[PDB]
Every structure is written in C-alpha cells, then in structure tokens.
C-alpha cells in the first residue's frame, strides 16, 4: 500500500500526533530512510519539519506504508506504529 492511499484526516493526524512526540523523532526516521546529514541540519532549523518531511517523502514512490512502518520499527517506534495502523489496515464494520 502507498501513503497516498490513506484518508486526508490520517495525513493530518500523522503530523498532529508527532508534534507531541519528541522534537527529534522525525530525525531518527530520516536517518533510517537514508536522508543525507546536511538535509537533517536544514530540517531541524524549521519550526515544524515533521510536516514538510511527509510531503517531501510523498514526492517519490518509496513513500509506501510498508516502507514507513519498516523504518519506524528500526527506531523503536512500534508503539506509535500500532496506533496509526488502526486506520492503516482493512477495517470497516459500519
């Protein structure tokens, strides 16, 4: 699945919940995504770089859910993964 497959409210919640997570949680993700160290110094200077990171990552096909989840496991964020996976899975009982 692609990150583009999620609803608009999920994409907003990924940002809004990460503002409560550590000011450098995104910094761990970027290192495991293989982003260059100079780009990390440009992002930490912004007020809300975590929002821009999702938009800059979504510029490429590498922005799959399976890849985002895999990278979150390397940085010991499997806690936050499971809670966002509540929408990011086949579930609609109505």
């Amino acid at each position: 699945g692609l990150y583009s497959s999620l609803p608009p409210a999920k994409r907003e919640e990924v940002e809004k919940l990460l503002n409560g997570s550590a000011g450098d949680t995104w910094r761990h993700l970027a290192g495991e995504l293989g982003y260059q160290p100079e780009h990390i110094d440009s992002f930490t200077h912004e007020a809300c770089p975590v929002r821009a990171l999702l938009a800059s990552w979504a510029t490429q096909d590498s922005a799959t859910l399976d890849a985002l989840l895999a990278a979150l496991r390397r940085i010991q964020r499997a806690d936050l993964v499971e809670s966002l996976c509540s929408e990011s899975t086949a579930t609609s009982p109505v």
Binding site: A9, K16, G20, S21, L84
Partner: protein, 174 residues
C-alpha cells in the same frame, strides 16, 4: 455630448472592472446563517502540555468517524491539559457542559464533566482549559485509550460529540 466628456469620465472604467469581484458574492449567499448549519460547534481540540516539546491539536466539524482510529502522543505518568475551542454564530446558550470519558483497552473506567458556563453569538471562538490530569504507566498500559467527548446545554441540546484515541508512549521529549 455623447463623445467628448468621456475624456474625464474614464475613472469609472477603473472601478467598473471591480464589479466582477462583487459578482462572486452571489455564488455564496449562505453567510453561515442558513438552517443547514448548527448553532455551536467545537472548531478543534488542543492539548497544552508544559512537559511536552511542543503543543498538540486536532481539527473538528468534519469526519468524526476517522478519529475512532487515529490517536494522540502522551508520556507514561505525565501531566497534561485539554483545551476545547468552539464557535457561536447563532444565539446565546447557557448551562453548557463538556463531558470527557476514558476507556482503557475498550473498557470505560470513569468519566469527568467540566462546566464551561454560558456564551453569546460572537463571530469568533471561545476556549476552555481543564485542570492538571495525570497519565497511566507500564508497557502494557502504552496501548490506545479511547476518549469520548460530548457537548450539551441546559436545554438538553447536543451540539457535537466525538471520540478519539490516545497513545501513551514511553518518551516524547528526551
């Protein structure tokens, strides 16, 4: 005459071009004052947390069914506050009450209700902040807590009600 005074009456063409921008107003005669819109709605919720690195918020007035899945980020045993923001574009309402429940692993344990008071038909939005609230602890208690939120008044009229999840994480700041 018909073709001599237009040499000075040209200023009319510089303000007549702006009449096309007035025509767009006719496309949206709703004024948010039609009976198809409610009296009072929570514009969003915000989580003010002096222990956190940054403030938290969530948008409202939309797809409340989505919030049953998406969650927040808190810390084990931390202190937090809940700020609720609502607009009032209709009439004065009184005895307004915000209700907040807490569900652990799909089981309610308790709920608390906080009186907001009375508010009038201001074009802007009012905010209410709760007292200090503690968080749960232990790796098993790091699961998603459902919070149910309700708004009612002395007239028994439900304004909006929603519900949202809450990840209790081990860290959120280092």
């Amino acid at each position: 005459a018909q073709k001599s005074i237009q040499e000075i009456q040209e200023l009319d063409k510089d303000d007549e071009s702006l009449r096309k921008y007035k025509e767009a107003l006719l496309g949206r005669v709703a004024v948010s004052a039609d009976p198809n819109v409610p009296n009072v709605v929570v514009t969003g919720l915000t989580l003010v947390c002096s222990s956190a690195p940054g403030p938290l918020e969530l948008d409202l007035t939309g797809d409340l069914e989505s919030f049953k899945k998406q969650s927040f980020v808190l810390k084990e045993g931390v202190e937090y506050r809940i700020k609720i923001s609502f607009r009032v574009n209709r009439e004065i309402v009184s005895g307004m009450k915000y209700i907040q429940h807490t569900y652990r692993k799909g089981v309610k344990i308790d709920k608390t209700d906080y009186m907001v008071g009375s508010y009038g038909p201001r074009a802007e939005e009012y905010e209410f902040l709760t007292p200090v609230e503690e968080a749960p602890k232990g790796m098993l208690a790091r699961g998603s807590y459902s919070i149910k939120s309700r708004f009612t008044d002395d007239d028994k009229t439900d304004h909006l009600s929603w519900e949202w999840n809450l990840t209790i994480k081990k860290d959120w700041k280092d």
